[PDB]
């Protein structure tokens, strides 16, 4: 089953990412970016440090990874959130909702071993919160997910294309030890929203981790389980 896993992993990584089939990995087009849930997805930008993903989950609250937030060193001035940013192939960058400053970083409110962080945004210069312009993501649960389930991962695969929202179909596997799945991702996908067919946020992509043996790997995310949901409800704003 290492050979089974190698074959399956190799469907996403055995070819160059531009040659992946569109059902596994595709750019979100302009029309789709304006619709839910794509419009909840933004670029978490720590200038000079990292460029990754976050999900708008509250009126002023973005959910991302702890490992992304940590690049800011507890300094909100170092982090911006660029919802639905798009840089085209010819260098034109659009930020239809503007760029949002960060008022507070909650680096590890779920625990240091849970790779999630909350970024609290300032309103815009007119006092408009991002969540007034965009309905935050509907928060679901990971409790009903099962091995083999198909989900959509949405985020900013920086290392593939800069500031271009993409969707990746993921396939859950071996959930006994967290949210694990096959799918194409790059480091910039850290913080990508994982959505079910009903558009509910059920997880956040984190990173790749060892799988089956020490020489193989799989994608890992943080599911919106009972604990994560409790903290979100406590801290969201």
| Domains in the chain, CATH or no CATH each | 2-31+139-225 (2.40.10.10), 41-136 (2.40.10.10)
**Total residue count of the chain as it appears in this document:** 237
Other C-beta atoms within 10 Å of 14: how many? 11
User: What is the spatial distance between Cα 38 and Cα 18, in angstroms, rounded to a whole number?
Assistant: 21
> For residue 219, how far is the Cα from the chain centroid?
12
Strands 138-139 and 200-211: parallel
User: What is the spatial distance between Cα 2 and Cα 9, in angstroms, rounded to a whole number?
Assistant: 10
Q: How far is CA 97 from CA 105, 128, 209, in A?
A: 21, 10, 34
Contact 163, 67 (CB under 8 A): no
How many Cα atoms within 13 Å fall on the side-chain side of residue 19?
Answer: 6
Task: Please give the backbone phi and psi of residue 18, each rounded to the nearest 5 degrees, phi first.
Answer: -65, -20
Catalytic, out of 84, 129, 142, 190:
190
Burial 159-170 (b: 16+ CB within 10 A, else e): ebbbbbbbbbbb
Establish whether 115 is a catalytic residue.
yes
User: What is the spatial distance between Cα 106 and Cα 37, in angstroms, rounded to a whole number?
Assistant: 24
Sign of CA dihedral 30, 203, 186, 60: positive
Catalytic, out of 5, 51, 67, 129:
67
User: What is the spatial distance between Cα 77 and Cα 59, in angstroms, rounded to a whole number?
Assistant: 20
Across-strand partners of 105? 119
Contact 190, 200 (CB under 8 A): no
**Experimental method for this entry?**
X-ray
Establish whether 5 is a catalytic residue.
no
Tokens of 160: 């593939």
Q: Where are the beta strands (DSSP E) in the chain?
A: 25-27, 41-46, 50-56, 61-64, 79-83, 86-87, 93-94, 100-106, 117-121, 138-139, 150-155, 166-173, 179-182, 193-195, 200-211, 213-223
Establish whether 216 is a catalytic residue.
no
SS3 187: helix
Resolution as reported, in Å:
1.5
Catalytic, out of 5, 51, 80, 115:
115
Q: How far is CA 228 from CA 14, 51, 94, 108, 198, in A?
A: 34, 24, 33, 11, 20
Tokens of 70: 């940590």
Task: Write the CB contacts of 133 (distance below 8 Å, at least 6 apart in sequence).
Answer: 97
> For residue 226, how far is the Cα from the chain centroid?
19
User: What is the spatial distance between Cα 186 and Cα 159, in angstroms, rounded to a whole number?
Assistant: 6
Q: Look up residue 230 and give its DSSP letter.
A: H
Contact 115, 222 (CB under 8 A): yes
């Amino acid at each position: 089953e290492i050979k089974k896993h190698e074959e399956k992993w190799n469907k996403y990584y055995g070819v160059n990412a531009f040659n992946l089939p569109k059902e596994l990995f595709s750019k979100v087009d302009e029309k789709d970016r304006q619709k839910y849930p794509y419009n909840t997805i933004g670029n978490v930008f720590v200038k000079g440090q990292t460029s990754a993903t976050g999900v708008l989950i509250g009126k002023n609250t973005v959910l991302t990874n702890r490992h992304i937030a940590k690049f800011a060193n507890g300094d909100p001035s170092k982090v911006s959130f660029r919802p639905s940013i798009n840089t085209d192939d010819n260098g034109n960058t659009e930020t239809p909702y503007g760029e949002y400053e960060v008022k507070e970083i909650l680096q590890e409110p779920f625990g240091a071993g849970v790779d999630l962080a909350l970024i609290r945004l300032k309103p815009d210069q007119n006092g408009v919160s991002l969540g007034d312009k965009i309905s935050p993501a509907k928060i679901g649960t990971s409790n009903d997910l099962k091995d083999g389930d198909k989900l959509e991962l949405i985020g900013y695969p920086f290392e593939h294309k800069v500031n271009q929202m993409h969707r990746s179909e993921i396939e859950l596997t071996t959930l006994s030890r967290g949210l694990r799945y096959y799918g194409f991702t790059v480091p910039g996908n850290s913080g990508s929203g994982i959505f079910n067919s009903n558009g509910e946020l059920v997880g956040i992509h984190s990173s790749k981790v060892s799988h089956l043996d020490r020489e193989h790997q799989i994608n890992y995310g943080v599911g919106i389980g009972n604990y994560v949901k409790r903290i979100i409800n406590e801290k969201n704003e």
